[PDB]
Design a protein around this motif. Structure first.
Motif, mmCIF file in Angstrom:
data_model
loop_
_atom_site.group_PDB
_atom_site.id
_atom_site.type_symbol
_atom_site.label_atom_id
_atom_site.label_comp_id
_atom_site.label_asym_id
_atom_site.label_seq_id
_atom_site.Cartn_x
_atom_site.Cartn_y
_atom_site.Cartn_z
ATOM 1 N N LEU A 174 -6.744 6.801 9.550
ATOM 2 C CA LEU A 174 -6.205 7.662 8.351
ATOM 3 C C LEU A 174 -5.521 6.724 7.355
ATOM 4 C CD1 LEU A 174 -4.520 10.169 7.442
ATOM 5 C CD2 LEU A 174 -2.657 9.661 8.812
ATOM 6 N N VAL A 175 -5.889 7.041 6.017
ATOM 7 C CA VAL A 175 -5.472 6.126 5.065
ATOM 8 C C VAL A 175 -4.194 6.781 4.411
ATOM 9 C CG1 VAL A 175 -5.932 4.846 3.010
ATOM 10 C CG2 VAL A 175 -7.737 5.250 4.646
ATOM 11 N N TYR A 176 -3.009 6.499 4.584
ATOM 12 C CA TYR A 176 -1.748 6.915 4.055
ATOM 13 C C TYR A 176 -1.441 6.132 2.758
ATOM 14 C CZ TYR A 176 3.335 7.497 3.452
ATOM 15 O OH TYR A 176 4.601 7.228 2.875
ATOM 16 N N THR A 177 -1.401 6.612 1.873
ATOM 17 C CA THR A 177 -0.942 6.080 0.467
ATOM 18 C C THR A 177 0.573 6.385 -0.012
ATOM 19 O OG1 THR A 177 -3.090 6.087 -0.360
ATOM 20 C CG2 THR A 177 -1.485 5.703 -2.236
ATOM 21 N N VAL A 178 1.486 5.256 -0.062
ATOM 22 C CA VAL A 178 2.727 5.352 -0.164
ATOM 23 C C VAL A 178 3.176 5.842 -1.731
ATOM 24 C CG1 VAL A 178 5.184 3.917 -0.371
ATOM 25 C CG2 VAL A 178 3.286 3.457 1.442
ATOM 26 N N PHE A 179 2.653 5.290 -2.618
ATOM 27 C CA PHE A 179 2.987 5.685 -3.843
ATOM 28 C C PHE A 179 1.991 6.693 -4.565
ATOM 29 C CE2 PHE A 179 5.346 1.714 -3.134
ATOM 30 C CZ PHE A 179 6.883 2.140 -3.666
ATOM 31 N N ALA A 180 2.132 7.844 -4.040
ATOM 32 C CA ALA A 180 1.419 9.005 -4.434
ATOM 33 C C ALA A 180 2.010 10.154 -4.677
ATOM 34 C CB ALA A 180 -0.002 9.256 -3.469
ATOM 35 N N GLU A 183 4.565 -5.537 -2.203
ATOM 36 C CA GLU A 183 5.589 -6.077 -1.324
ATOM 37 C C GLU A 183 6.377 -4.895 -0.645
ATOM 38 O OE1 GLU A 183 7.710 -8.819 -3.923
ATOM 39 O OE2 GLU A 183 5.811 -10.176 -3.626
ATOM 40 N N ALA A 184 6.871 -3.734 -1.439
ATOM 41 C CA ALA A 184 7.745 -2.687 -0.882
ATOM 42 C C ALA A 184 6.927 -2.129 0.484
ATOM 43 C CB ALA A 184 8.240 -1.723 -1.921
ATOM 44 N N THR A 185 5.727 -1.814 0.123
ATOM 45 C CA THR A 185 4.797 -1.316 1.029
ATOM 46 C C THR A 185 4.781 -1.813 2.393
ATOM 47 O OG1 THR A 185 3.657 0.203 -0.608
ATOM 48 C CG2 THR A 185 2.492 -0.158 1.536
ATOM 49 N N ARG A 186 4.383 -3.385 2.082
ATOM 50 C CA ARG A 186 4.017 -4.215 2.961
ATOM 51 C C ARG A 186 5.309 -4.284 3.990
ATOM 52 N NH1 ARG A 186 4.302 -10.066 1.396
ATOM 53 N NH2 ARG A 186 6.545 -9.602 1.106
ATOM 54 N N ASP A 187 6.399 -4.573 3.414
ATOM 55 C CA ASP A 187 7.831 -4.842 3.975
ATOM 56 C C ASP A 187 8.149 -3.903 4.977
ATOM 57 O OD1 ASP A 187 7.424 -7.348 2.844
ATOM 58 O OD2 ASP A 187 9.442 -7.151 1.582
ATOM 59 N N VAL A 242 12.815 0.380 0.392
ATOM 60 C CA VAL A 242 11.961 -0.055 1.444
ATOM 61 C C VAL A 242 12.361 0.877 2.551
ATOM 62 C CG1 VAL A 242 11.485 -2.065 2.797
ATOM 63 C CG2 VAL A 242 11.633 -2.349 0.340
ATOM 64 N N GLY A 243 14.031 1.028 2.884
ATOM 65 C CA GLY A 243 14.309 1.762 3.931
ATOM 66 C C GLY A 243 13.578 3.033 4.104
ATOM 67 N N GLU A 244 13.532 3.881 3.008
ATOM 68 C CA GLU A 244 12.863 5.237 2.891
ATOM 69 C C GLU A 244 11.499 5.262 3.293
ATOM 70 O OE1 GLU A 244 14.042 8.506 1.439
ATOM 71 O OE2 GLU A 244 16.354 8.135 1.427
ATOM 72 N N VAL A 245 10.651 4.300 2.605
ATOM 73 C CA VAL A 245 9.277 4.102 3.111
ATOM 74 C C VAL A 245 9.299 3.897 4.430
ATOM 75 C CG1 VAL A 245 7.227 2.929 2.451
ATOM 76 C CG2 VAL A 245 8.790 3.224 0.551
ATOM 77 N N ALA A 246 10.004 2.956 4.898
ATOM 78 C CA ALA A 246 9.987 2.669 6.466
ATOM 79 C C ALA A 246 10.111 3.784 7.322
ATOM 80 C CB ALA A 246 10.972 1.644 6.711
ATOM 81 N N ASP A 247 11.075 4.721 6.825
ATOM 82 C CA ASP A 247 11.481 6.154 7.525
ATOM 83 C C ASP A 247 10.113 6.969 7.607
ATOM 84 O OD1 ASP A 247 14.472 5.577 7.375
ATOM 85 O OD2 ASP A 247 14.431 7.860 7.559
ATOM 86 N N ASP A 248 9.484 7.302 6.500
ATOM 87 C CA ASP A 248 8.209 8.035 6.196
ATOM 88 C C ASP A 248 7.096 7.198 7.269
ATOM 89 O OD1 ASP A 248 9.973 9.551 4.589
ATOM 90 O OD2 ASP A 248 8.147 9.636 3.179
ATOM 91 N N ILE A 249 7.080 5.880 7.440
ATOM 92 C CA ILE A 249 6.154 5.388 7.968
ATOM 93 C C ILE A 249 6.449 5.669 9.695
ATOM 94 C CG2 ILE A 249 5.057 2.991 8.746
ATOM 95 C CD1 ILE A 249 5.489 2.149 5.724
#
Ligand SMILES: [Zn+2]
Ligand SMILES: [Zn+2]
Ligand SMILES: [Zn+2]
Ligand SMILES: [Zn+2]
Ligand SMILES: [Zn+2]
Length: 266
Positions: free
Chosen positions: A32-38, A158-162, A126-133
């Protein structure tokens, strides 16, 4: 094997790890390839976004994210892997707490200037992205996550990786970082991870020539990006081929990844 790839933008996973993704699916892994900034952006768009949309071969007020999502589906379809498009708005669509655009244009400079913003605003992104991940991890149950090293220091990389590192740590899932392409052809390679994380020894993969070919064909689906990627010399694939040639000068095509591990005394 359940491989979750986390791409900052629509194209990064395919450019940097397309061959590994296509090889994974071929071997029978669930990929599965999930793209953050979409995130789907609405008009009004900023001047800087409007300009980007023109560089991508679109009308200033076209639904650019829809077009790029479609390209992403075509490319991942080509590698025979699934996609998932995230809710997060790319840098050119985000506003700051004070109401300003995050990104503004300057006259006479190629790269767009990012407005200064609070550490709080970054922590929160970063917190919100982490939540979604974390939720995706619960839903998909990956055996391995791969995401970007953020070579090139793109803030969205950097935001995605972190966020991926924080989420995978909490969820006890092994994580690897890919070498960002084409960034790594133009930028050194040393990166600064959040405190407590570090890179293990590199692995440069060995892929069948046919997976190389499939990767490059998949890259070609991102039509909007060809001007940005081919650059001046119109030789993206030459540069990509040359890079892989160096990192296995006794082998063929391949992609560099590093495992992420906890630092000593952390
Ligand atoms: Zn990117
Ligand atoms: Zn879909
Ligand atoms: Zn971005
Ligand atoms: Zn920031
Ligand atoms: Zn390299």
């Amino acid at each position: 094997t359940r491989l979750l790839a986390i791409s900052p933008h629509l194209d990064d996973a395919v450019l940097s790890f397309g061959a590994g993704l296509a090889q994974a699916a071929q071997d029978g892994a669930n990929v599965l390839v999930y793209t953050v900034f979409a995130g789907a952006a609405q008009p009004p768009y900023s001047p800087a976004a409007q300009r980007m949309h023109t560089i991508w071969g679109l009308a200033p007020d076209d639904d650019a994210v829809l077009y790029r999502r479609k390209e992403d589906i075509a490319a991942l379809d080509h590698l025979r892997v699934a996609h998932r498009h995230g809710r997060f708005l790319d840098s050119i669509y985000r506003k700051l707490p004070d109401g300003r655009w995050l990104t503004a244009h300057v006259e006479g400079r190629q790269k767009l200037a990012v407005n200064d913003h609070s550490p709080d605003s970054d922590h929160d992104l970063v917190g919100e992205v982490a939540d979604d991940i974390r939720s995706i991890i619960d839903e998909f149950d990956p055996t391995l996550v791969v995401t970007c090293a953020a070579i090139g220091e793109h803030p969205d990389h950097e935001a995605t990786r972190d966020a991926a590192l924080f989420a995978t740590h909490e969820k006890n899932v092994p994580v690897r970082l890919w070498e960002d392409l084409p960034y790594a052809v133009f930028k050194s390679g040393a990166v600064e991870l959040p405190q407590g994380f570090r890179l293990g020894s590199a692995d440069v993969s060995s892929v069948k020539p046919e997976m190389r070919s499939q990767k490059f064909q998949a890259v070609e689906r991102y039509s909007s990006q060809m001007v940005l990627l081919n650059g001046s010399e119109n030789n993206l694939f030459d540069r990509l081929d040359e890079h892989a040639r160096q990192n296995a000068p006794h082998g063929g095509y391949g992609e560099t990844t590093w495992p992420v591990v906890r630092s000593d005394d952390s």
